[model samples]
Target: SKPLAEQDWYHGAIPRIEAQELLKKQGDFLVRESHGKPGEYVLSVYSDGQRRHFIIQYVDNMYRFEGTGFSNIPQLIDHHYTTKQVITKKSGVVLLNPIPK
Candidate 1:
């Protein structure tokens, strides 16, 4: 897989306000570097008239959401894309469109 920075959907260090603006449709999403938190990534999804944020946790050398893990962000995103799995029970949305950075 390509590097995280090379991923079109990976918006490095973008503010949440801007992310919210970019997400204009349900399931439209992007992965952004967490504000003021180095080495962390947040998954932002547009759903129900709002942008929901989920911090992709890096634990034990794996990237994950609420559960399940991947070796990299691309893999994690791919897993969701192929499975059509919900990002989370609370968010109840899946990644459909990847908003490019």
Candidate 2:
């Protein structure tokens, strides 16, 4: 697979106005595809000085798994659906399934 930075849809800088809009519409979350499954994942958006990052998971299967950096929000939405809430830690390593609203 190509590096994430190489993706055509990737927007290098999230414009302040646009980022705010996105946050309002979708929350401060980034979505991306999982490496192991043909599914989507959700990640928290983080800004570390000059760079941005997301949280993700390392799934051995649908159940057994580990986690990594921030994930993609869209992917998380896909995994859990709109009624569910996906929560994660600051390092983007852990994931929690909150009660659906």
Candidate 3:
């Protein structure tokens, strides 16, 4: 067997793609794949000059988010979703997300 991440196929890469898309529109953020699982990635979102890391797991082609997150926004442009509320929240944050519904 070979590494899952090394597989020459991708059913769902939304977690990383979405994070990077958001970052492209708005800076201070990054998204990259991890070696934990087949669909695992880390997202670093910076707000107010402070940065935080959030783990995103792709399950059933959908990213699992705890709560307090924005999903399916009309636009993903800059400032389309702000992290002001997350500046003080001591919890993982998911600014923008999309679920194929």
Candidate 4:
């Protein structure tokens, strides 16, 4: 498994304290693997004293968050609950096929 920072999908610095918090909150569901496999992973974050879960998976050369409610930063508290997606294009990542067209 690669370190979070070393992972190509990692967007930015995940604060030590915030990362620790996330680990503590979602330790049970955290899957620290990187090999572009299709499966289920969950990220739990605590904000404003509330906990939320976001489903994540690696597919099509991209690490995508499925379901919803994933906050990019710990300080941002607006739970969009929207279907959010991101891809690392320059990093050789690709989005899944049959993209919204």
Candidate 5:
């Protein structure tokens, strides 16, 4: 976890639908508190017809998808958006636009 000073996309403790509603188009994404998975984070994206959620694994103080981990949430986001990298193999989803604040 990290400071959210400039993370407009970081929706604190919001419901799953709240994150889904914000993502209307392909590549639209947001980060929110995991639904029913207490104390974890979820990265929600719109692609392949509907909204999909990916849990951000915080292992050993690093955030990762079982890939090159980032020091914090924003760094992980920056890496994905900048490269438009697929968030996960299972979904092949990518983060493009951060839901506006």
Candidate 6:
């Protein structure tokens, strides 16, 4: 058979603007794969004080946070949450510490 057409296997790449928006939504910053596959880039965000949890999946070139990404709405209740905390020091200086050996 002839090689598969490029479009057939393509999952439209998420553009720069969307990723930027995602960062602003909850997380303080962002770090992502350069050439992530369709389902490779998954992000989770939690409401303030970790009151609720939400998952965003980059599936089929779009973002979905509904039934597909989650088992159920209640599944993301406060009991299951995600909060991106920025560690700080006595002087209130935010710390981006490097990994330890």
Q: Which candidate is the best by lDDT?
A: 1
Which candidate, 1 or 3, would have the higher lDDT against the true structure?
A: 1
lDDT of 1 by residue, 7-72 (tens): 888888889899978999978999998885777889989888888888888999899887799888
Cα shift from native, residue 74, model 4 (Å): 17
Per-prediction tally of clashes:
0, 20, 0, 0, 0, 0
Give the Cα RMSD of candidate 1. Answer: 1.4
Better candidate by TM-score, 4 or 5? 5
Tens digits of lDDT, candidate 4, 1-101:
33444433232333334433443321112222222332444344433234334545445644454333332321111122222223222322122221010
Off by over 4 Å in 1: none
Put down candidate 5 lDDT per residue, 1-101, tens digits, no spaces. 55865688888888987776688998998888876899899888899789988889999989998589988888998899999788987788888789975
Candidate 3 runs further than 4 Å off: 1-27, 35-38, 48-50, 68-89, 92-101
Residue 54's lDDT in candidate 4:
50
Tell me the lDDT of candidate 2. Answer: 0.34
Model 4: runs farther than 4 Å from truth? 1-38, 66-101
The CA lDDT of each predicted structure is 0.86, 0.34, 0.39, 0.31, 0.85, 0.28
lDDT of 5 at 93: 88
TM-score for each candidate, following the candidate numbering: 0.90, 0.28, 0.35, 0.28, 0.90, 0.21
| Model 4 TM | 0.28
Candidate 5 off by > 4 Å: none
**Backbone steric clashes in candidate 6, count:** 0
Candidate 2, residues 41-101, lDDT tens digits: the string is 3333323322223433544433211322224333433443343333434433222222111
Task: List the lowest-lDDT window of 10 residues for candidate 2.
Answer: 92-101
lDDT of 1: 0.86
Of candidate 4, the 10-residue stretch with the lowest lDDT total is 92-101
